[PDB]
Every structure is written in C-alpha cells, then in structure tokens.
Design a protein around this ligand. Structure first.
Ligand SMILES: Cc1cc(NC(=O)c2cccc(-n3cc(NC(=O)Nc4ccccc4)cn3)c2)ccn1
Length: 349
C-alpha cells in the first residue's frame, strides 16, 4: 500500500521508495547525506542523496533549485545524470525532503589523489575532467568551484563531476561545516571577473595535488591562500594588477614580493614515474601542462580546448566525447515559501 519505507542512517532518517534496498552510508556534505542502495527495479546499485528542507535558507535553496534545473540542461558521460528524483511527502504543505538518485560510483577523487597513479590513469582522469568542463562551458555553465570532493570515479577509471558550481549572482550558514576554497582561481579569490579558463586553475590544483600528495594552496581563508599562490608561483606581472578592483589591487601590490619557484622545483622528477623513457617523456609533458594551468593571470592561462590538445592529454582524444550538442534562467532573491514551491514543482515535473 505505502510506496515508501523509513530507515535510520547515522542520525538521519531516509524515507525512500521500496525499490531501493539495503541502504549503507557512503558520504557526507553540507547539502546532504549520501547512501549506496540496491535498486530492485533497474537491478543495479545506486547512490541516494537526501536534501533536508533545502528551502530552509537562500544558500541551500538556490543550490538545490539550480542543480535540479541544470541537470536537465546537461547530458554528458562525465557529468552527473539523475536516475530518479522524489519526495515521500504528498503535498506542498507537507513537503520537507528531496531524494536524488544516480549511478553508484566507487570512490571520491580525494581517495584517488592519495594513491600513486601511473601516467595512463592520471592523464585519463584529467582528460575526462576537461571533457566535463568543456560540456558545461558549451551549455553556458562556468563552474568556478571544481574540487575533488565533488568528483567521483569508478574502478574502470571513469569519472563524473557531481555539481554545477557557484551561483551567477553571489551568503551565510549556521551549519558547522566549512566550504573548501583551496581549488578556487585567483579571479575568484580576488573577485575579478572571469571566463571559461577560471576552471583550468582548479584542474591544475587537482593535478598538482595528485603529483605532490599535498594541497597546493592551503590556508584559513583567502589571505593565507593568496600567500601560498604568490610564494610558489611568484608575484603576478603589472598587466595582471590593472584588471583588479582598486582596493584589492592596493592589498595585492602591497604584499611582500616573491620571485616564485620554477616548475621543476615545484614538481621534481621524484614525484613522477620516470624510470622508462616512456615515463621520462610523460613526466616532462605532465610538468609542462601544470606550468600552463597554474598561471595566476587568466590572460596567460591555457584554455580548455588547448589543454585537450596538450600532448599529455590528447592520447585519449575522441570527437564523439569532446563535443556533445549543447541546448529559462533564474537569478533572484526569494523567501522560504517561494523557494519551497519552486523546488517542489521541479521535483513534481
Ligand atoms: C560497488 C559499490 C560501490 C560503493 N561506493 C562507495 O563506497 C562510494 C565512495 C565514495 C563516493 C561514492 N559515490 C558518491 C556518489 N554520489 C554523491 O556523492 N552525491 C550525489 C548522489 C546522488 C545524486 C546527486 C549527488 C555516487 N557514488 C561511492 C559502495 C558499495 N558498493
């Protein structure tokens, strides 16, 4: 009779459709808790994320709504695709939670970064991240907040990006969670204005960490983080400074000057499989790509198309996956009641 059932999953109550069985916790985040499950209807394993009262505040609401909308605008093997969306609640008045269902993956990219990976695996993960970012850019979506915790992989080395990044407008959270900012581009750190290659910096940060096994640009907030960028890469050129707002420009120019380390110093041969001649050349190509991605000035940073054509990446190139047909737009402040209805009607398509 009742098409739903409830189970306790570490404090959280998961009320799901009876087709989803044997729920087990797999992940946590600000926006929701994630379970693995067996889908008896599709006869396959799935991941179920629970969004609890996503209309409770502006931050959760914009993100929940934006991502329910954008998932219908996108169709690419390297981007999250939903198998199902549902709410156990019967009316708008009763509405509390949203459950999102996707293919069950095997790991988060944080786990993969901790491993020693050959150049075949690393170049393939990067190629897929670039394909996913290319597809998002073609659909008018510049991410600006790509990070490993929002990227998932399968044992076969296949990869998917799980989110759509930053709102095209903007904020406060009572939740004790902290937003990971270490992969953000200088144009985001310094509130500059950006183009598609803002996402290249984030790929560079991920690639760098895969090699170094340490976050490249850590820090308590943007102050410490900027210090890390300039100490390693060196103070940017005068041409860069001109594009900064006058107040951020003053702070940036009055920071201590740094020459910055060269890329062989930043990423020595020790960090690379560089035993065979094949590995020696791939190590040289990997460092070359990193030197083109970790570039402070976006005017001098490599583009998505040029990174895809890079010798380190182009061995995976296939036209069927580099280009997919790219096909209304919300940018408004709303009350709890407004967001609850906007979300509910997206859920009830
Ligand atoms: C064969 C097998 C594999 C596993 N998998 C894991 O242990 C694992 C580990 C880390 C991440 C993931 N994973 C995380 C998602 N989705 C989301 O995080 N977020 C998300 C969900 C739904 C919609 C929108 C967004 C997908 N898989 C799985 C467990 C048991 N057996």
């Amino acid at each position: 009779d009742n098409q739903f059932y409830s189970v306790e999953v570490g404090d959280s109550t998961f009320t799901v459709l009876k087709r989803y069985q044997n729920l087990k916790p797999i992940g946590s985040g600000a926006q929701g808790i994630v379970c693995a499950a067996y889908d008896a209807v599709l006869d396959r394993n799935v991941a179920i994320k629970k969004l609890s009262r996503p209309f409770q505040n502006q931050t959760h609401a914009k993100r929940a709504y934006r991502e329910l909308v954008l998932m219908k605008c996108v169709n690419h093997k390297n981007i999250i695709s939903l198998l199902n969306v549902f709410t156990p609640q019967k009316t708008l008045e009763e509405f509390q939670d949203v459950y999102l269902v996707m293919e069950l993956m095997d790991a988060n990219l944080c786990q993969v970064i901790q491993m020693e990976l050959d150049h075949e695996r690393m170049s393939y993960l990067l190629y897929q991240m670039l394909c996913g970012i290319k597809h998002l850019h073609s659909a008018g979506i510049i991410h600006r907040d790509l990070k490993p915790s929002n990227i998932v992989v399968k044992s076969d080395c296949t990869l998917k990006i799980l989110d759509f990044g930053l709102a095209r407008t903007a904020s406060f959270m009572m939740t004790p969670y902290v937003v990971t900012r270490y992969y953000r581009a200088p144009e985001v750190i310094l509130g500059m204005g950006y183009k598609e290659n803002v996402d290249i910096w984030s790929v560079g940060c991920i690639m760098g960490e895969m090699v170094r096994h340490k976050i490249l640009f850590p820090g308590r907030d943007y102050i410490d983080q900027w210090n890390k960028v300039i100490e390693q890469l060196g103070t940017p050129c005068p041409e860069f400074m001109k594009k900064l707002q006058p107040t951020v420009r003053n702070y940036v120019e009055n920071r201590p000057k740094y020459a910055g380390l060269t890329f062989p110093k930043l990423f020595p041969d020790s960090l690379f499989p560089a035993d065979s001649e094949h590995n020696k050349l791939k190590a040289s190509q990997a460092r070359d790509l990193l030197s083109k991605m970790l570039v402070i000035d976006p005017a001098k940073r490599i583009s998505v198309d040029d990174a895809l054509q890079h010798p380190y990446i182009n061995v995976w190139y296939d036209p069927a996956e580099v280009e997919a047909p790219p096909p209304q737009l919300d940018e408004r402040e709303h009350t709890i009641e407004e967001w609850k209805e906007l979300i509910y009607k997206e859920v009830m398509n």
